[PDB]
C-alpha cells in the first residue's frame, strides 16, 4: 500500500499481547483453515464447555534456544510445550477434552552479514521414531513429551543397546524428518523458511486436526513443530557463531470439556 | 411398475 | 464442478515481454509455490489440452484390491498329535508394505472396505490318499467377542458375529464393510498414547504404547476348515484382499522412504541410506 | 441365454446376507397375528429401563442378593467413598451384568448418557445427605469427596422423595466406546460419598441399605453386532 | 413390481438408491426390508397409572 | 430360472474390478464425517506443491542433510556448470524421491510442464547472477555455458526476491513420458551456471548454499497406475 | 431405479452410456461411481494469509 | 525352484494375428484378452493335486519383477492381477487403447537414440526399428498353491 | 412414523437453576 | 440406459431387432457394436491432383 | 532504539498489573502484557499500559 | 430409458 | 425410474 503497509512488516494481537516484526514473509494458515470453537453440528460431549478466552489464547514465549554451526535442528509437540503455560496448562489439566487451534511465531534474527536457512514445519500427528531396534513403539510417555524445552533432532541413528534399562526415547535423525520419510518432502506440510538474508520469522496460524472433534490434550498431541536448518549458519569468518531462536506460541479457539479434579501427570 | 419409499 | 475426467486447461499463446512483471521472481519462505505456466517464462503456442487427470483421483488411486494377511490353516488325521490348526489374525493394513505406503501418503482416511478372500490347499505328506472338497469358515470376531481355542468350539456357532462359509474352487469370497471407524475418520498416524500416567500410580501402571490408541482396534478374523479330521491331511492358505471403495483423504505427508519396521513409524540401523551416488554435474 | 458372468462373491454363504429363498411350505394358511401387550420394536428400549446394581462383589456377597445391598451406617462424617465404580458399563463386572451392561455385550460399540438412580431403604426416621459423583477419565480416580466435588454431582437430600438420579453425561472424545476395558475409550469413575452423614433418632436401626440403579438416556444407541461372552456351551 | 428406496449413506465418495423385485408369491421367501419402526419405552419405563412429570415430585 | 449362459471372465477375480457385494453390517451405524482441514481430491495437487531436491548425491553427501545444499562460491567466473540433470522425474536419482518422483513411481506414464525454484541462502550481502537451464533432448548435453544458453532458460539476478522459478514447457514428441529411464521418451538436460559470478564484500562468507525446488504445473497428469519400486517387503 | 451415465469414450469403432442399478441397501455394498470431483491445490501450494499475485513480487 | 512365468507383452512372438495387424502402418484399438488354462501331471506318480488357483499379474513397465514366486511383488497394491480358479470359464479382461502415442506403430524407421560423435558408438547406439525397450510391460504368472509332493 | 435409522435426540443448550422444580429427586416405588 | 438396434435378417423362419446394456464406466470394456461404416477407395485408387473422369483420356 | 542500522534485535516490553512477584524472569514477564519489539527501519515502540486498577483514581 | 438405431 | 447423469 501507497500509505505504506507491507508483507514484512506484521503486527499481531492476542489477549494482553503483541508481536511485532518488520522483516516477515508473510505469514502462513495451515490448509487454509483459520481456527474455530467447535460447532453444533459437529459436537460430541454434551456438557457446557468450559471457553477460557483471553486467559488462555495468548502470546506464551518458550525457552529460547541457541542455533550453531553443529545444530542439527528441534521439535516440539501441541500442546504438549504449551502444558505449563499460564492459565492455558491449568484448563487442559483441570478437563478431560479440550481442543486447540495455534498462532506459531518463531524468532530469529541475526544480520546482513550472516547466513543460514531453518525449514519450520507444522506437522499434523508428528509421529516420531523411536531409539530401539529391540521394541518398537516403546518410547515412553515422559520422553514423548519434553514439555517447553522440547527435544532435537540427530544426523545419526544410534540404537539403545542397553536391554536391562533400556532409554525409551526418540531417535529422531533429521534427513529422515524423524520418522522415515525424507525431510525434502516436509515442505507438503504448512511451513515457512526463515532465510536470513529476507526474514527474521516464520509465522504459522494453526487450525485443530484430528480424526475427532475433541479429544484428549494429555494423552495426545495434535500438531508437532519442527525446525531444521536446511542452509547451516555461517557468519563472516567466524568458526563458531552463533544465533538464538525464540518460539511465542498462542492458543487460539480453545476449549474444554469433561470437567472434574486436575491431573497430575508423571513427568520424569 | 414402480414404487418408491 | 470440475470433474476428475475433465481435460486440464489449454496452453494460451504468449509472445514477448519487456516489462515490470516479475513472474519468475519469487520467495519460498513465504511457505507459497510460485503457480507458474510455460507462457510465463517462455513464449508459447496454442495448444488444445486433452489429457485428465481422472487415474489419479484418490478413488482411482486406490481403487485395487491389495494383499494384506495370508492365514494357515490345516485339517489333519485325526490321529495327530499336533492339533489341528485354525487361523486368527488381527485386522490391520500394516503386516504388508504396499497398501500400506499408499494409505500412508495421508494422515486420515475415511472408506468404506471390500474384503476378497483367495483360498488355495495342498498335499504335505508323500501319500496317495484323497479328501473330498473343503468348507472354509472365516469368522469375523469384533473387540469383545469370545475367540476360538478350538477348531470345533462354541463360538463357531457365530449367532451374531458375521461368518462366511466358503466353499473350495468356488469364485474368491467378498464382502463389504461400511466406514467403522469409533472417531470421524481413521487415523493413519496416532501421535499420542491410550493411558496417561499419573503420579500417584506406579510406572507400570501408567504405561502404555507410543502411537497405539484402541489395543483391539477392529478385532480379528478366525479361520478354519469346517471339514472332520480326514486321514490325509490337507494344509490351506486364505490370502486377504483389501480394497479401500468411496474414499476420502486428510492431510497430505511424505511417503515412507526407509523400510517398515513395525506397526509405528520406527526403522532399524543398517535400512537408513535410501539413495544412491549420483555427482552434482553429472546428467 | 442371457449372457451373465459370475462376479467375486459367488456360491458364498456370508450369514449376515439378505436375500430371498423358495419357501418349502407354499400357500401355508398362516394364523394372524393378535394384540399381545409388551411389544418391543428396539433394544434400546430395555436399555432405558433402570435395573438394579450388584455393587458389591465381595468374595462371601457375590453370587447371593446381598451383592445388590450397599450398606450404610449413621457413623460420624467421613471423606471416604461408600462405592467406587468403573463407566465402564459392558465390562466393570458391577455394571455388565445389568439389563444394560447385558445388551451392550451383544455390540461393539456404545454411546450417549447415561443415569444412576439410588433408593434409600432406611427408615423413615433416618435422614441424610450423600454426594453422588461422576468424574470423567484422565484424573486420579476421586478417593475423596474434595476430589469428586470437582467433578459432575449430585448431593442428594434424604426424605419423602426416596430416589434420587444423577445423569452421566456423554462426555467422551471417540464418538462411540468400546464394550470392553479399553483406556482409548474409558469413562472415568462413579463414587458415592457421606456429604453429611446419616442421623436416626432412638429405637431405630443405625444401619441400612441403598440400592443403585442404571439406565440409558434417550441419546443412547449401539453398534457393530457380536457374540457375547456372557454365555457358553463347552461341549 | 419394482420397489426402490433409499439408502442412508454413510461414506461418500442427491439420495442414492437401490432397487427390489420380489420374485416369489410368499412373502415368507422375501428378504428382510430393514425398513423398521421405532416406539416409545413408555409400556416398560412409566408403566403408571397417573401420568409422570419429571419436574414434579414422584409422589405427592 | 431365467434362461442365462455363463460368458468368459466367469468367476475370476480381476483385483482392479468394481463391483458391489453384499453388506457384513447390516444397517451399522456409521459416524459422520466432520470438516477436517487438509481434504485432498486428487494425487497431482501433492505433485504441484514445491519439495526439495537432493542435488549433491555424492558418497559422502547422500543419504545426510548436504545432499539439499548446491554449494556456491565467489571465485572467478566460469563457464563450467554448478550442477547438471536429466529430466527423467521419476527415475533420476535426484528427482525420483521428491514428492513429485514418488507420485510418478505409482504411475507407468507422465506429461505435462515443471518447474524448478531456487533459493539463494547467502548473505544479504551477497550478490550474483546465475543462469538456469533446458536443452530438450536430441543434442549433445550443456556442459558449458555457450551450449546451455541456447536453449530454455532463465538469467536469474540474485536480491531481495531470494527465489527464482525456470518453467520447463511441456516439449515431447510422445503425448506421455515413460516414467523410467527410457532413450524413446528423454526429457533432456536441466543445468545451472553462473552468468556473472558471486561478488561479496569483506567480512562476509565467500562460500554459500542455493537450495532447489520441483513441482509440476497446471497442466501435468499421469496415468497407468502400478505398483512402486520405492518400497519393499522382503521375506 | 436405474441409473444412467455417460462414459468417456477412449478409442472409436453420440453419447455412450451405462447403466447401475444398486442391489444392495448398504450403500457400502454399492460399487464405487468413479464420478470425482477435482479441486484447486491452493490450501497446500498457497496457504499464505495474503493472497499472491504471481506477476508481483512475493515480498513487497 | 518353483517356475513362474514372465512375458513381455507383444503380438510379434505368433505369427498370424502379427501379419493381419501388418496390413496396415499404424493401429488404435481397446484389447481383449481371454486365457485359457490347462494342467497335466508329469511323473508317473499316483499322487494328487488339489484344484489350482493361477495369478496373473500385470507389471507395467518400471513396477518391480518377481524374482521368486512368492516374493513381495504378487502383493499387487497397485498392479492389475487376474486370480483364476482352475477348471472355471477362462479368464478375461479388456484394456483401453494405451499407447504413449496417437497410435500404435507397427513399424518404425527408426532408433531410440542419436549417435553423437562427441559420445563414443557404444553410448550412442541402439536397435533399428525399436522405440521403448519395454514396450507395455509383463504378463507374470504363478501356481498361488503351495508346493506339493505331486508337481 | 419414526424409523429405527432416524437419529436420536439432539442435545439441548441449558444453563444455571434454582427452583422448585426438581427432576432429579424421584421414587422407584411406583415402578418408573 | 437400453440400446435397441435391429438386426439385418439373413435366413427366415416386421424388423428383428435386439437390445443392448452397458454394464461398465469404461467404454473400453463395451462390446464391439459392428455398426460400422463405409467409405470411398479414392484416397488409394484415386490419389491424382487432377480429378479423373473415366470416359476421357487420362493423359490429355 | 539508537543502536546503527547494521544491528538487529528483538526485545520484550512488558506491564505486570499488581499483585504478584514482580517479575525478574522473561517468563514471568511474557504472562502479563506485553509487546515483543522487533528492531528495524521503524526505530521505534510503544507498549500501552493500559488502565487496569482496583480503585477508580489511584494515589499520587 | 432407450436409445434406438 | 431412471436417474440420467
Ligand atoms: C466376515 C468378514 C468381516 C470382516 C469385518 C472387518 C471389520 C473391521 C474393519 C477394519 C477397518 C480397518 C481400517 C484400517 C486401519 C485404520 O486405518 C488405522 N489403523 C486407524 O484407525
Ligand atoms: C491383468 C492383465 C492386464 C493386461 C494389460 C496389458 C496392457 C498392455 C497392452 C499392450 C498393447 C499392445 C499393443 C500392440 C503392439 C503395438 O501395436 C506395436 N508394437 C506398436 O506400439
Ligand atoms: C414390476 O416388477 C414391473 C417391472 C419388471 C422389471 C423387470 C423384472 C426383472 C425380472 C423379474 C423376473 C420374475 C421373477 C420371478
Ligand atoms: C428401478 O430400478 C426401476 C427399474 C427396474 C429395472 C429392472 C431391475 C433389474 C433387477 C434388479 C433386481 C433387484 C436387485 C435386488
Ligand atoms: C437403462 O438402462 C434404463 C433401463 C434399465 C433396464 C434394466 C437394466 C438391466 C440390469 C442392468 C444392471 C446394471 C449393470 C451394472
Redesign the interface.
Given at each position: 500500500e501507497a500509505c505504506g503497509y507491507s508483507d514484512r512488516v506484521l503486527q499481531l494481537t492476542l489477549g494482553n499481547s503483541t508481536i511485532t516484526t518488520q522483516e516477515a514473509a508473510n505469514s502462513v494458515v495451515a490448509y487454509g483453515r483459520w481456527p474455530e470453537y467447535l460447532r453444533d453440528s459437529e459436537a460430541n460431549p454434551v456438557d457446557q464447555p468450559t471457553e477460557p478466552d483471553v486467559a488462555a489464547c495468548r502470546f506464551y514465549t518458550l525457552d529460547t534456544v541457541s542455533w550453531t554451526k553443529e545444530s542439527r535442528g528441534w521439535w516440539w509437540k501441541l500442546p504438549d510445550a504449551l502444558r505449563d503455560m499460564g492459565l492455558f496448562g491449568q484448563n487442559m489439566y483441570y478437563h478431560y477434552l479440550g481442543r486447540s487451534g495455534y498462532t506459531v511465531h518463531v524468532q530469529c534474527n541475526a544480520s546482513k552479514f550472516h547466513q543460514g536457512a531453518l525449514g519450520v514445519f507444522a506437522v499434523p500427528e508428528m509421529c516420531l521414531a523411536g531409539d530401539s531396534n529391540t521394541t518398537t513403539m516403546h518410547t515412553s510417555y515422559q520422553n514423548a513429551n519434553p514439555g517447553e524445552k522440547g527435544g532435537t533432532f540427530t544426523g545419526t541413528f544410534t540404537p539403545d543397546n542397553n536391554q536391562t534399562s533400556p532409554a525409551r526415547r526418540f531417535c529422531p535423525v533429521d534427513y529422515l524428518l524423524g520418522n522415515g520419510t525424507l525431510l525434502g518432502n516436509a515442505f507438503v506440510f504448512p511451513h515457512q523458511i526463515i532465510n536470513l538474508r529476507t526474514n527474521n520469522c516464520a509465522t504459522l496460524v494453526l487450525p485443530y486436526v484430528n480424526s475427532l472433534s475433541i479429544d484428549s490434550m494429555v494423552k495426545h498431541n495434535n500438531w508437532g513443530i519442527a525446525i531444521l536448518p536446511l542452509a547451516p549458519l555461517n557468519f563472516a569468518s567466524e568458526s563458531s557463531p552463533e544465533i538464538p531462536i525464540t518460539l511465542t506460541i498462542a492458543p487460539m479457539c480453545c476449549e474444554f470439556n469433561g470437567l472434574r479434579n486436575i491431573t497430575l501427570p508423571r513427568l520424569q | 411398475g414402480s414404487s418408491s419409499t | 464442478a470440475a470433474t476428475s475426467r475433465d481435460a486440464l486447461p489449454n496452453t494460451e499463446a504468449s509472445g514477448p515481454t519487456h516489462s515490470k512483471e516479475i513472474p519468475a521472481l519469487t520467495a519460498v519462505e513465504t511457505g507459497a509455490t510460485n503457480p507458474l505456466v510455460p507462457s510465463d517464462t517462455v513464449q508459447t503456442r496454442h495448444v488444445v489440452q486433452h489429457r485428465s487427470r481422472s487415474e489419479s483421483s484418490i478413488e482411482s488411486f486406490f481403487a485395487r484390491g491389495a494383499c494384506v494377511t495370508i492365514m494357515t490353516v490345516d485339517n489333519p488325521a485325526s490321529t495327530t498329535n499336533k492339533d489341528k490348526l485354525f487361523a486368527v489374525w488381527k485386522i490391520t493394513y500394516k503386516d504388508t508394505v504396499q497398501l500400506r505406503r499408499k494409505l500412508e501418503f495421508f494422515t486420515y482416511s475415511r472408506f468404506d472396505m471390500e474384503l476378497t478372500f483367495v483360498v488355495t490347499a495342498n498335499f504335505t505328506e508323500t501319500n496317495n490318499g484323497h479328501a473330498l472338497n473343503q468348507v472354509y469358515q472365516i469368522m469375523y470376531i469384533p473387540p469383545g467377542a469370545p475367540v476360538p481355542e478350538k477348531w470345533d468350539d462354541y463360538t463357531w456357532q457365530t449367532s451374531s458375529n458375521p461368518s462366511i462359509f466358503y466353499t473350495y474352487g468356488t469364485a474368491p469370497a467378498r464382502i463389504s464393510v461400511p466406514y467403522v471407524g469409533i472417531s470421524n475418520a481413521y487415523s493413519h498416524f496416532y501421535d499420542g498414547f491410550s493411558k496417561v500416567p499419573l503420579k500417584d500410580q506406579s510406572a507400570a501402571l501408567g504405561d502404555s504404547l507410543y502411537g497405539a490408541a484402541s489395543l483391539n482396534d477392529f478385532g480379528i478374523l478366525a479361520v478354519r476348515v469346517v471339514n472332520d479330521h480326514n486321514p490325509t491331511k490337507v494344509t490351506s492358505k486364505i490370502r486377504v484382499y483389501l480394497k479401500p471403495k468411496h474414499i476420502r483423504v486428510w492431510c497430505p505427508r511424505p511417503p515412507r522412504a526407509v523400510a517398515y519396521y513395525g506397526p509405528g513409524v520406527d526403522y532399524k540401523d543398517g535400512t537408513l541410506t535410501p539413495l544412491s551416488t549420483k555427482d552434482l554435474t553429472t546428467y | 441365454?442371457?449372457?451373465?458372468?459370475?462376479?467375486?462373491?459367488?456360491?458364498?454363504?456370508?450369514?449376515?446376507?439378505?436375500?430371498?429363498?423358495?419357501?418349502a411350505?407354499?400357500?401355508?394358511d398362516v394364523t394372524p397375528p393378535i394384540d399381545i401387550?409388551?411389544?418391543?420394536?428396539?433394544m434400546?428400549?430395555?436399555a432405558?429401563?433402570?435395573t438394579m446394581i450388584p455393587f458389591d462383589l465381595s468374595a462371601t456377597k457375590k453370587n447371593t442378593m446381598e451383592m445388590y445391598r450397599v450398606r450404610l451406617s449413621d457413623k460420624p462424617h467421613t471423606d471416604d467413598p461408600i462405592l467406587c465404580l468403573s463407566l465402564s458399563p459392558?465390562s466393570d463386572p458391577r455394571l455388565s451384568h445389568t439389563m444394560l451392561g447385558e445388551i451392550l455385550?451383544?455390540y461393539?460399540?456404545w454411546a450417549?448418557?447415561l443415569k444412576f438412580?439410588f433408593?434409600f431403604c432406611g427408615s423413615m426416621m433416618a435422614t441424610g445427605k450423600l454426594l453422588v459423583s461422576y468424574?470423567?477419565?484422565?484424573?486420579?480416580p476421586?478417593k475423596k469427596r474434595?476430589?469428586?466435588m470437582?467433578?459432575?454431582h449430585?448431593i442428594?437430600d434424604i426424605g419423602?422423595?426416596?430416589?434420587?438420579?444423577?445423569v452421566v453425561?456423554?462426555?467422551?472424545?471417540?464418538?462411540?466406546?468400546?464394550?470392553?476395558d479399553?483406556?482409548?475409550?474409558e469413562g472415568?469413575y462413579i463414587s458415592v460419598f457421606y456429604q453429611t452423614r446419616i442421623v436416626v433418632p432412638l429405637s431405630t436401626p443405625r444401619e441400612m441399605d441403598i440400592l443403585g440403579?442404571v439406565?440409558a438416556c434417550?441419546?443412547?444407541?449401539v453398534?457393530?453386532?457380536?457374540?457375547?461372552?456372557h454365555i457358553?456351551?463347552?461341549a | 413390481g419394482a420397489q426402490v428406496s433409499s439408502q442412508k449413506v454413510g461414506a461418500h465418495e442427491s439420495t442414492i438408491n437401490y432397487t427390489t423385485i420380489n420374485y416369489y408369491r410368499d412373502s415368507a421367501s422375501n428378504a428382510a426390508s430393514k425398513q423398521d419402526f421405532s416406539q416409545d419405552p413408555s409400556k416398560f419405563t412409566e408403566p403408571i397409572k397417573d401420568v409422570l412429570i419429571k419436574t414434579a415430585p414422584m409422589l405427592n
Open positions: - | - | - | 441365454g442371457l449372457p451373465v458372468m459370475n462376479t467375486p462373491g459367488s456360491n458364498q454363504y456370508l450369514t449376515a446376507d439378505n436375500f430371498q429363498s423358495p419357501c411350505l407354499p400357500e401355508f401387550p409388551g411389544e418391543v420394536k428396539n434400546m428400549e430395555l432405558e429401563i433402570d459392558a455385550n451383544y461393539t460399540h450417549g448418557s438412580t433408593l468424574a470423567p477419565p484422565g484424573a486420579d476421586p474434595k476430589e469428586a470437582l467433578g459432575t449430585v442428594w419423602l422423595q426416596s430416589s434420587c438420579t444423577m453425561p456423554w462426555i467422551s472424545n471417540t464418538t462411540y466406546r468400546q464394550t470392553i479399553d483406556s482409548f475409550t472415568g440403579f439406565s434417550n441419546d443412547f444407541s453398534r457393530l453386532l457380536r457374540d457375547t461372552t457358553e456351551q463347552k | -
